Amino acid sequence: QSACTLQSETHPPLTWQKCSSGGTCTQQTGSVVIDANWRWTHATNSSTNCYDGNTWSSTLCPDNETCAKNCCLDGAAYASTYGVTTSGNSLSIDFVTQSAQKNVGARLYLMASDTTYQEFTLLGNEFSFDVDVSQLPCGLNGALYFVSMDADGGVSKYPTNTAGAKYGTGYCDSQCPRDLKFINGQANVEGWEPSSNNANTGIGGHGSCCSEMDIWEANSISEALTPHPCTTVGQEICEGCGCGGTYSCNRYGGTCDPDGCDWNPYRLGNTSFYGPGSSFTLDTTKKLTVVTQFETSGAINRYYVQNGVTFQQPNAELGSYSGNELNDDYCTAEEAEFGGSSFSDKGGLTQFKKATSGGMVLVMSLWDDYYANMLWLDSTYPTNETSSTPGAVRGSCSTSSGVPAQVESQSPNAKVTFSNIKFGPIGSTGNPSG
Ligand SMILES: *[C@@H]1O[C@H](CO)[C@@H](O)[C@H](O)[C@H]1NC(C)=O
Numbered sequence: 001q002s003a004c005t006l007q008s009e010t011h012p013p014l015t016w017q018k019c020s021s022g023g024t025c026t027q028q029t030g031s032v033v034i035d036a037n038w039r040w041t042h043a044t045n046s047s048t049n050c051y052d053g054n055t056w057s058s059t060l061c062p063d064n065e066t067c068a069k070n071c072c073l074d075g076a077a078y079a080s081t082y083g084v085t086t087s088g089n090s091l092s093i094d095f096v097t098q099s100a101q102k103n104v105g106a107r108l109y110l111m112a113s114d115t116t117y118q119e120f121t122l123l124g125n126e127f128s129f130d131v132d133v134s135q136l137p138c139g140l141n142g143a144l145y146f147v148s149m150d151a152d153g154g155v156s157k158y159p160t161n162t163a164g165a166k167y168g169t170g171y172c173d174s175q176c177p178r179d180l181k182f183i184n185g186q187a188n189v190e191g192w193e194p195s196s197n198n199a200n201t202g203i204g205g206h207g208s209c210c211s212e213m214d215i216w217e218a219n220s221i222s223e224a225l226t227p228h229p230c231t232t233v234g235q236e237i238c239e240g241c242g243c244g245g246t247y248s249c250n251r252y253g254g255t256c257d258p259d260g261c262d263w264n265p266y267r268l269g270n271t272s273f274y275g276p277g278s279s280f281t282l283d284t285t286k287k288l289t290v291v292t293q294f295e296t297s298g299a300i301n302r303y304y305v306q307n308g309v310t311f312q313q314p315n316a317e318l319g320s321y322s323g324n325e326l327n328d329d330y331c332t333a334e335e336a337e338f339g340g341s342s343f344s345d346k347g348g349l350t351q352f353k354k355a356t357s358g359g360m361v362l363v364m365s366l367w368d369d370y371y372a373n374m375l376w377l378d379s380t381y382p383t384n385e386t387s388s389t390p391g392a393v394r395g396s397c398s399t400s401s402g403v404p405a406q407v408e409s410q411s412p413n414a415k416v417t418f419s420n421i422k423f424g425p426i427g428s429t430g431n432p433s434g
């Protein structure tokens with residue numbers, strides 16, 4: 001797709017700290033850009049939509065190539081249309097924003113320049129950030145994570161994509177998403193099937209795969225840390241059901257691990273660690289600091305800070321595993337006790353280490369779940385299971401919670417705020433910011 005300018009594109013600025021082993025941190029200046037799927041896609045020489053509702057223009061987009069040639073992505077009014085705002089080192093994303101039309105959430109990427117994404121090499125370093133999830137009820141997911149995307153959004157590999165990172169192209173994750181309207185410089189109209197429960201989305205014949213490090217997926221009820229390896233580390237297109245993931249006719253069999261080795265304190269047994277109010281170790285009605293360290297062994301460590309008090313990830317005992325470090329033993333024990341073989345089939349932490357050793361793009365989003373109502377994060381899932389089933393309960397939310405239309409109608413003002421991002425060598429982000 002190309003880029004049009006009927007609507008100007010001004011990326012909300014966002015600063016962050018780059019810390020060094022020497023003990024000091026220096027401020028960096030970047031910005032955020034919204035993913036291409038949220039944009040208006042229209043004809044290059046007119047205002048005629050190439051995509052509207054959940055279907056494509058049969059005339060402008062008869063096939064993927066013709067569609068990309070005839071269509072362009074336009075600018076985004078971040079605050080008025082998407083409910084996205086920033087202030088210094090803080091970023092806020094509203095849930096439902098009403099303008100001429102209704103918008104739900106957003107997916108944003110941190111940029112290095114107005115035309116390139118900021119790449120981070122996680123291995124050997126740690127990532128710290130503050131978050132306010134107080135306004136996130138059951139069914140919502142305020143997420144901060146990393147994916148192995150190209151810094152240019154795919155332009156160098158696919159010249160038919162001239163919009164690039166400036167317009168949020170090139171997304172990919174461990175679900176090998178097929179809902180993307182443009183992949184590899186081509187539209188995804190071929191094989192497109194409108195969503196049965198979402199008037200704005202659909203699934204196409206192509207998907208976009210790549211490694212995914214879900215540092216933070218949570219709401220005021222539950223939170224999870226989850227590495228997702230793929231046999232091909234970076235962004236790579238996939239065909240139909242062979243894509244795997246939630247969309248496909250079979251979530252497995254693809255090149256990526258859609259499940260991942262997840263660590264949810266509640267799911268592991270400590271139901272008093274994270275929640276709303278003073279009855280929990282971490283009070284989700286108040287802002288908290290989340291630090292994630294990627295040691296060179298490939299294992300992941302985590303600690304939290306709230307009101308000046310530090311808490312390491314709570315210990316968990318599963319099978320023969322005992323500890324609070326997300327390592328090979330934990331992941332293998334999880335599969336043995338909770339079931340599944342996706343994470344290990346895709347190479348586990350050894351394969352994932354290939355992703356963190358390379359560059360990954362920072363993603364921050366807010367979304368509700370049109371496939372599983374976010375029950376996998378904050379409720380009992382599958383819903384027919386009980387606490388007697390290992391790992392079935394992940395949160396205190398009712399198994400009836402999270403219906404998109406309902407939470408969108410009831411909690412339109414929900415929101416998430418990410419702030420004070422700090423990145424640097426392990427043990428360095430706690431020092432004074434620049
Ligand atoms: C949960 O984790 C916190 C922090 O590690 C700990 O202080 C508390 O005792 C744990 N509670 C339970 C029930 O495991």
Ligand SMILES: [Co+2]
Nearest residue numbers: 205206238239
């Ligand atoms: Co194809």
Ligand SMILES: [Co+2]
Nearest residue numbers: 300301302326
């Ligand atoms: Co970890």
